[PDB]
Design an enzyme around this catalytic site. Sequence first.
Site, mmCIF file in Angstrom:
data_model
loop_
_atom_site.group_PDB
_atom_site.id
_atom_site.type_symbol
_atom_site.label_atom_id
_atom_site.label_comp_id
_atom_site.label_asym_id
_atom_site.label_seq_id
_atom_site.Cartn_x
_atom_site.Cartn_y
_atom_site.Cartn_z
ATOM 1 N N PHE A 23 0.887 -1.150 0.000
ATOM 2 C CA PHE A 23 0.000 0.000 0.000
ATOM 3 C C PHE A 23 0.925 1.199 0.000
ATOM 4 O O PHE A 23 1.116 1.814 -1.049
ATOM 5 C CB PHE A 23 -0.896 -0.096 1.258
ATOM 6 N N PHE B 74 3.051 10.128 2.317
ATOM 7 C CA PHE B 74 3.189 8.691 2.194
ATOM 8 C C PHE B 74 3.691 8.417 0.794
ATOM 9 O O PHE B 74 3.429 9.222 -0.112
ATOM 10 C CB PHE B 74 1.861 8.017 2.426
ATOM 11 N N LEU C 274 -7.646 6.708 -3.350
ATOM 12 C CA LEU C 274 -7.197 7.845 -2.565
ATOM 13 C C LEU C 274 -7.375 9.126 -3.323
ATOM 14 O O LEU C 274 -7.336 10.215 -2.749
ATOM 15 C CB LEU C 274 -5.774 7.579 -2.208
ATOM 16 N N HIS D 34 -6.326 13.018 -1.192
ATOM 17 C CA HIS D 34 -4.990 13.328 -0.657
ATOM 18 C C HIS D 34 -4.292 14.025 -1.779
ATOM 19 O O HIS D 34 -4.376 13.498 -2.898
ATOM 20 C CB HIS D 34 -4.196 12.071 -0.336
#
EC number: 5.2.1.8
Lengths: 220, 220, 220, 220, 220, 164
Positions: free
Chosen positions: F59, F112, F121, F125
């Site tokens: 991930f 990240f 996502l 983000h």
Amino acid sequence: PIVQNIQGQMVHQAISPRTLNAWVKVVEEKAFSPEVIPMFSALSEGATPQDLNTMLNTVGGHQAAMQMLKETINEEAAEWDRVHPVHAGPIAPGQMREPRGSDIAGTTSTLQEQIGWMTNNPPIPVGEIYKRWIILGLNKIVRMYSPTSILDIRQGPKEPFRDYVDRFYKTLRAEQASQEVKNWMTETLLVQNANPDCKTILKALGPAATLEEMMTACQG
Amino acid sequence: PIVQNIQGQMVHQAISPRTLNAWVKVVEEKAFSPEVIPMFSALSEGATPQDLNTMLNTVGGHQAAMQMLKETINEEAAEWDRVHPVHAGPIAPGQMREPRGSDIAGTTSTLQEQIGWMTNNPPIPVGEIYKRWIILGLNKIVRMYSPTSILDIRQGPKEPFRDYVDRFYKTLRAEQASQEVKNWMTETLLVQNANPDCKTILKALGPAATLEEMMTACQG
Amino acid sequence: PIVQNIQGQMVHQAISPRTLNAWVKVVEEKAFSPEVIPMFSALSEGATPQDLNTMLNTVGGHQAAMQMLKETINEEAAEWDRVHPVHAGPIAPGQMREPRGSDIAGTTSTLQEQIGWMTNNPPIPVGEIYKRWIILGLNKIVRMYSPTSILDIRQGPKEPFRDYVDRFYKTLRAEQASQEVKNWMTETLLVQNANPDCKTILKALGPAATLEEMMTACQG
Amino acid sequence: PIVQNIQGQMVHQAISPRTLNAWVKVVEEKAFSPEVIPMFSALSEGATPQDLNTMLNTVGGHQAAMQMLKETINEEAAEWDRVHPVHAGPIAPGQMREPRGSDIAGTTSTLQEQIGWMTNNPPIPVGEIYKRWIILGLNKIVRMYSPTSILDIRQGPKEPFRDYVDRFYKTLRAEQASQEVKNWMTETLLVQNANPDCKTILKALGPAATLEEMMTACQG
Amino acid sequence: PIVQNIQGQMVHQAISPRTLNAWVKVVEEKAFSPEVIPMFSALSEGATPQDLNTMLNTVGGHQAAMQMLKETINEEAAEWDRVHPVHAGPIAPGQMREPRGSDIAGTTSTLQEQIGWMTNNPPIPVGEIYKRWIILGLNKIVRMYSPTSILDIRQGPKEPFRDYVDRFYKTLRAEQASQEVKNWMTETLLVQNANPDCKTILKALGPAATLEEMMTACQG
Amino acid sequence: VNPTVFFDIAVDGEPLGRVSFELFADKVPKTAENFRALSTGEKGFGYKGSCFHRIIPGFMCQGGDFTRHNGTGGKSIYGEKFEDENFILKHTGPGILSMANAGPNTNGSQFFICTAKTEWLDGKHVVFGKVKEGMNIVEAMERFGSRNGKTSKKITIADCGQLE
């Protein structure tokens, strides 16, 4: 403001305290005269937008005039965005930054971005654009600070022609109009509002006479 | 304050007596008005915490304002120490120990350590942090010196509109509650408190009226 | 002073005529106000005992204060020589001898010895000790120039709280008490010596009284 | 209004009569009050533009307010058309064309097109946009139906503090000039307009006082 | 509010208009009394935070009470944030994130997020927590709306014991205190504030006499 | 034109490799300046000596909490938090560098690095950079993490700075 540094590489040099003190003193001593515009344009040669923001914040008093200046800067930025929107086109091989109305006004643009936009080749004239905006605002302010209209300028019964023409030309310079309007006004209004004693003298010289001839005529 | 050399590096330089003299003179002559924060930020660009403690301790008189500034700096230093705890034990050879809040203030550290922090790789901006704290303290001080509140403004029957708007924008810049609240105030309270004759002259132009026409309406 | 050359050896430099003129001017102009000690510590930075003796001798007038300062320097030198033994005999090359009190005072040494003691490894802060002694002397002097005591300050019936606290903090800055005792004084006597009206106002305000809320409460 | 089924999909459903009856009853019985907007937003959740035009046309009486709402919807529709211009060229196979500013209102489109717009992939929230526009119009309507301004509030000598604060917060929620300006008003105007006895009782608690203690002070 | 749907799968069902009309009627006639908290808890069983916000917005008038409720909800949210910190980072695909302090009040949490938090296994009791907060606020408001204190309840000379005990117990229920304190409050205040003849009649029964015997004593 | 920063990664003090990032300052400028300035440490505080506190194999690797070291802290160079600049760029594959947050307009310093395509996502983000050199160093890091994120060894940003 950035300055040509030996050799041939412009580096950022912060605004000197003596320049800020000179600006504060000229705004304190001379208030808002027509001449301040040239003094401001000469005190801030090649200044980053941050330096001009500093010089406009360091002013003491005249907050109404500063508010008109800020609002006219906003209007110019708004019109600039309207006149310079991103229309779809093929992307350029070389990318250079771009200054927004808010990027030109130094509000949301960091100092590094402005240094980039100035020293990059080709240069982006952000400093000169913001200076044009501030100069338009200062013209508005100095035309507002005019105490009386140019049409009301009239000579006293014993007021010498010297002080009369001095005050008349001062108010005319503070007044705003095209150059041809001023050319017509200096020929239609100057001789008419003079004192009759010297008005006859100016009429005897002629309509198209120059300033020095009339001035030496009513001299004394 | 640090200054760059010909080759680009920077090293400590003794504080100029002219800077201190100008700062003390402007503090004495201009008291505590909105136009001391820009001049303070311009005078001490790149100044070490020792230089800022000098410029603050040198201000004779108005000791209550200086005590307020000291309390604000103390609270900011305590919050900085709470948000950034310092590590214990041996420190790496290529790194100098990180400063605490009381050391960011420059109260318990030598000048050489400040210079090492400011010229480290990467540089640590202790001077800029302490300058931000001093600017916040000066904002609180100029808030305290504000003579009247924003709501109590009411123009007299004879007080000209120019003086009214001057006083209004002066105490408005001295208020500094917010930006959008200031924008709402300059729309509502500015036109709500005019003299009846010029009041209705301004209402004739509607809320779309700008400040320039707002003034030239009541002008003459 | 001793200016540190950029990326090079620190070079000795004679005290500037501008620095000495500013010093003698502030002495003559402000007599001995509590800020002369910060301004002196600002002007004299990294200076040798020769420079400090020159800056002290250029002072004209106040010969009683000058003699008291010299007596304080003598007492400090005597204490230093008493609590620090002085070695003698042959001295190894490349290592300066033990600095005596009369030498750290600069009365029995030369600029060469001062620069040697300030360039040694590890350095010996002869300048920073002689400046500390001069600051102790100037503190004694400014305490002697205190016109009134701190315990005898009383607010006038018409004299406002701002002026009262200004005088109170000026006398507090002039006061000689330790900082731990200095705090209790500004915590208690400030509200205990004011006029009855704002005295009851601050009593209703109660504990945790700070200068900002005190002054905002005693308004009007 | 659309409704989800057991399988999860949604399809048009005829508007329920006792929703229209409840809306007409609450509009007439409560006339216009700040608590008509939450009821309207709750009654017509997921309603198509045809259903909202129904709920608006069904309001008999107060035709001036309905015309204000129609004008507000009219201006809002024009802004949507101006902000986004339809793209030219070939359209993707998996996508089809969007509605116009006037068709968001549902004035010139059938119900099946509204259902297709609301259940498309991805769904287009025409109902939510038109509901936002109607809510803005209702906010302007309840602003007009305000019986006073926020500044004119002054509690009578006998009018209890409870009724004063009720009227204050009623016309404050009916003002909706901003949110932070509301936060400043509830600090200043709430404390500035109290009856002298309870006024100084509130001043006894300082500005740090909250509303609960503010009322229980004047209570009893 | 969500409801168990055949078979065993909870789906979202919007709040019915009849429930909102019942709530508006009970906040129109009952207004604020002790019985409103129980009625509110029964009308909003298992309601999503959006439904409770809708039920709190529809209340017309009593804006001070609604502001108290909103402020106490904010206070409870801040306390929940201080007790239950929320860690930042990417969420797991299977489980939902821990709701923040403002995700409970339905301010920044979309309806889908709340439905997820409620129907997930294990469920997050957002609805019950927001109901507890609203119930605390309503308790505050109903204890504020009390006209007189419990200590001021006194029986009239000919006012029957029925009305006296009814009013006394009503004010005692509206009052806020622990049940343990009420156990002493009743035995200390009920018999003392009665009429002298009925006072002796109840004292003849004994101190620990029950309510029914005390009643049937002075019956008629 | 677009800045490039690096991270020299360490696993309990043993040096592991250098990851370098191209920051898309031409589309997400304020987001890219905040990661650039926190990497240089020029504003006084930053990433050097912070660790990846949450690594989920397949991930992403998350890090950047230099104040609390566990995902509850960090701060930006504009204050503690700032707006979501925009969502032009999407999570298209491994190596994309995206901003962590605690819901919308809550960006601070946590970021990240994706090690897979994470299209879910998108829109939530801000993406502002991608790995340039060093993706197998990011891949090797995965082995020190777990399904729930907890890492088995301390993984630190030993040094970081700007390259270009």
